[PDB]
Design a protein around this ligand. Structure first.
Ligand SMILES: CC(C)(COP(=O)(O)OP(=O)(O)OC[C@H]1O[C@@H](n2cnc3c(N)ncnc32)[C@H](O)[C@@H]1OP(=O)(O)O)[C@@H](O)C(=O)NCCC(=O)NCCS
Length: 247
């Protein structure tokens, strides 16, 4: 139980990425632990809210690239695919607390959280195109809808990174805060606010908010994943990926 810590407090389940030497790069075993932690907590009436964080300095550099190179996953049927499906379908409040880098799925998973808090100077990007890859986790749908095409394109067709401050201005984050522990403390207070509300009013509000979009999102995630899986096995991406290793 070495790389994903699962602190079960009062009504609040905390998934804490703990792989600091690798900038919390997500392995198949981390995705698997998070997918099952979500799916259990989903059924655990004791659990009211989930918090996701990498701690005070780092959120996640995204997918482990070695994993991408050695064993290209089919996104649907894979640990990453099961993590994506689990978070997407998670019916209770999910809160992210982000410091430092949030890269690739480090940013896109935030598009499925109910509240997102970031350090002002966190570093967010979607470097898919830089790596011969394409958008993932429904970001090709969510981001143009939220931001319009041109602004989304800056993030997805150019892979432009952006600060936590900028994430809050655009509404990807709910607030940009003092970097470090403050981000987590404020996220914990938001979780405590949810504890004061009727569990089913919250849960049902969240379902109504996703209902008009979820079928299209399910279908977009499937198209993206087929493109992404194919590209991982093509030379363009293999070259860019092993180039990042051996930088
Ligand atoms: C997040 C990032 C900007 C931080 O950069 P940094 O401060 O220079 O720290 P490093 O890049 O040197 O990372 C430190 C170590 O973690 C490793 N690492 C970091 N991210 C990794 C990743 N996604 N996959 C595999 N290893 C990773 C480095 O290879 C390095 O390993 P080593 O110390 O054993 O040699 C940079 O690590 C990065 O760009 N990582 C990959 C981001 C990415 O492309 N994710 C996938 C998108 S599909």
């Amino acid at each position: 139980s070495e790389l994903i810590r699962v602190e079960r407090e009062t009504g609040l389940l905390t998934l804490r990425l703990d792989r600091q030497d690798k900038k919390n790069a997500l392995t198949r075993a981390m995705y698997s632990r998070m997918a099952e932690a979500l799916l259990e907590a989903q059924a655990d009436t004791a659990v009211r809210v989930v918090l996701i964080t990498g701690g005070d300095a780092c959120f996640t550099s995204g997918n482990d690239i070695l994993d991408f190179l050695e064993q290209p996953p089919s996104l649907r049927d894979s640990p990453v695919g099961r993590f994506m499906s689990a978070l997407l379908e998670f019916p209770k409040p999910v809160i992210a607390a982000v410091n430092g880098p949030a890269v690739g799925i480090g940013t896109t998973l935030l598009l499925h959280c109910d509240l997102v808090f970031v350090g002002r100077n966190a570093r967010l990007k979607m470097p898919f195109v830089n790596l011969g890859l394409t958008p993932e986790f429904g970001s090709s749908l969510i981001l143009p809808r939220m931001l319009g095409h041109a602004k989304a394109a800056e993030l997805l067709m150019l892979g432009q990174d952006f600060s936590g401050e900028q994430a809050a201005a655009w509404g990807l984050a709910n607030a940009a805060l003092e970097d470090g522990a403050t981000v987590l403390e404020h996220a914990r207070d938001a979780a405590r606010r949810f504890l004061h509300l009727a569990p089913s009013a919250v849960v049902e509000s969240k379902r109504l908010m996703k209902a008009p979009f979820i079928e299209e999102l399910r279908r977009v995630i499937a198209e993206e994943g087929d493109i992404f899986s194919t590209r991982l096995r093509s030379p363009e991406a293999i070259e860019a990926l092993s180039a990042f290793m051996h930088r």
